[PDB]
């Protein structure tokens, strides 16, 4: 069946982002480790790497502010709570059947339930308190073997992006233990081989400062997970 490589990708906090992360005490600070430009660049690189292999990729964001900043910047479709049934089905049908559209962004509305589509790669932008078990379930529902690499060691991929020096790390020793105990191959990636051969966003300090201003303008409400019933 699907043979899944699980990885955490540890990304340093930009010093400007780390500065504010410390100073801010309300849940607003979650947005600084979520929008950290090193983490965005890692996500962007992974989408490029996998799209070159014609893999299908779902990127999960539990936070709507982040869902849009990522998807719109990377020019990928996104689905969340207020997305109409018609537009949602357009996007899912595109993901499933149109070879030009192989990456989509989905929020907490994905699990569960509408019918999560199948993909070969699942990237989680965030990690939080506290459901290790909902993570593995979603991984399981989404990930299917890329056909046909039956020879290959891994044919599907899960990545969880973690910001260093933030509360995100605490969730890591936990996730690693849980996933391996569940029978998964798991590793920690601190440096993505050859990100410097790609043209990624936020290469300049000024670009990062633009995003930083936008994050600082957000409120504690913007840093809450999307809730849905």
Curated annotation (Swiss-Prot):
Enumerate the spans annotated as Helicase C-terminal domain: 41-201
The UniProt record gives the binding positions of ATP as: 141, 144
Question: Which subcellular locations apply to this protein?
Answer: Nucleus
Q: Which residues form the signal peptide?
A: none
Q: Which domain of life is it from?
A: Eukaryota
Q: Where in the sequence is Phosphoserine found?
A: 185
The UniProt PTM text for this protein says:
Dephosphorylation reactivates the 5'-excision step. Phosphorylation has no effect on transcription or the 3'-5' helicase activity.
The portions of this protein that span the membrane are: none
Disease per UniProt entry: Xeroderma pigmentosum complementation group B: An autosomal recessive pigmentary skin disorder characterized by solar hypersensitivity of the skin, high predisposition for developing cancers on areas exposed to sunlight and, in some cases, neurological abnormalities. The skin develops marked freckling and other pigmentation abnormalities. Some XP-B patients present features of Cockayne syndrome, including cachectic dwarfism, pigmentary retinopathy, ataxia, decreased nerve conduction velocities. Trichothiodystrophy 2, photosensitive: A form of trichothiodystrophy, an autosomal recessive disease characterized by sulfur-deficient brittle hair and multisystem variable abnormalities. The spectrum of clinical features varies from mild disease with only hair involvement to severe disease with cutaneous, neurologic and profound developmental defects. Ichthyosis, intellectual and developmental disabilities, decreased fertility, abnormal characteristics at birth, ocular abnormalities, short stature, and infections are common manifestations.
What does this chain do?
ATP-dependent 3'-5' DNA helicase/translocase. Binds dsDNA rather than ssDNA, unzipping it in a translocase rather than classical helicase activity. Component of the general transcription and DNA repair factor IIH (TFIIH) core complex. When complexed to CDK-activating kinase (CAK), involved in RNA transcription by RNA polymerase II. The ATPase activity of XPB/ERCC3, but not its helicase activity, is required for DNA opening; it may wrap around the damaged DNA wedging it open, causing localized melting that allows XPD/ERCC2 helicase to anchor.
What does the sequence similarity comment in the record state about its family?
Belongs to the helicase family. RAD25/XPB subfamily.
Further information in the entry reads: The TFIIH core complex from patient XP11BE (a patient with XP/CS who has a C-terminal splice-site frameshift from residue 741 in this protein) reconstitutes in vitro transcription about 30% less well than wild-type but does not restore NER in vitro or in vivo. The XP11BE TFIIH complex has all the subunits in the same stoichiometry as wild-type. Purified mutant protein has very weak 3'-5' helicase and ATPase activities. In another paper the mutant protein has wild-type 3'-5' helicase activity. The mutation is recessive to wild-type. Conventional DNA helicases unwind DNA by binding to a ssDNA overhang of dsDNA and then translocating on this strand with cycles of ATP binding and hydrolysis to 'unzip' the dsDNA. XPB/ERCC3 is believed to be an unconventional DNA helicase principally because it translocates in a 3'-5' direction along dsDNA instead of ssDNA, thus it is referred to as a DNA translocase.
Subunit structure, per the record? Component of the 7-subunit TFIIH core complex composed of XPB/ERCC3, XPD/ERCC2, GTF2H1, GTF2H2, GTF2H3, GTF2H4 and GTF2H5, which is active in NER. The core complex associates with the 3-subunit CDK-activating kinase (CAK) module composed of CCNH/cyclin H, CDK7 and MNAT1 to form the 10-subunit holoenzyme (holo-TFIIH) active in transcription. Interacts with PUF60. Interacts with ATF7IP. Interacts with KAT2A; leading to KAT2A recruitment to promoters and acetylation of histones. (Microbial infection) Interacts with Epstein-Barr virus EBNA2.
Q: What is the protein name for this chain?
A: General transcription and DNA repair factor IIH helicase/translocase subunit XPB
Q: Which organism is it from?
A: Homo sapiens (Human)
Name the gene that codes for it: ERCC3
């Amino acid at each position: 069946i699907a043979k899944v490589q699980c990885a955490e990708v540890w990304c340093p906090m930009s010093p400007e982002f780390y500065r504010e992360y410390v100073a801010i005490k309300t849940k607003k600070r979650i947005l600084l480790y979520t929008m950290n430009p090193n983490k965005f660049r890692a996500c962007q690189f992974l989408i490029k790497f996998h799209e070159r292999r014609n893999d299908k990729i779902i990127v999960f964001a539990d936070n709507v502010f982040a869902l849009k900043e990522y998807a719109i910047r990377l020019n990928k479709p996104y689905i969340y709570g207020p997305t109409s049934q018609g537009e949602r089905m357009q996007i899912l049908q595109n993901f499933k059947h149109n070879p030009k559209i192989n990456t989509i962004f989905i929020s907490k509305v994905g699990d569960t339930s509408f019918d999560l589509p199948e993909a070969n790669v699942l990237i989680q932008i965030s990690s939080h308190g506290g459901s290790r078990r909902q993570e593995a379930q979603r991984l399981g529902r989404v990930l299917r073997a890329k056909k046909g690499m039956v020879a290959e060691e891994y044919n599907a991929f899960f990545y969880s992006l973690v910001s260093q020096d933030t509360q995100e790390m605490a969730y890591s020793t936990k996730r690693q233990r849980f996933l391996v105990d569940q029978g998964y191959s798991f590793k920690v990636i601190t440096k993505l081989a050859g990100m410097e051969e790609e043209d990624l966003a936020f290469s300049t300090k000024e670009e990062q400062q633009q995003l930083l201003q936008k994050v600082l303008a957000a409120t504690d409400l913007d840093a809450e997970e999307e809730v849905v019933a």
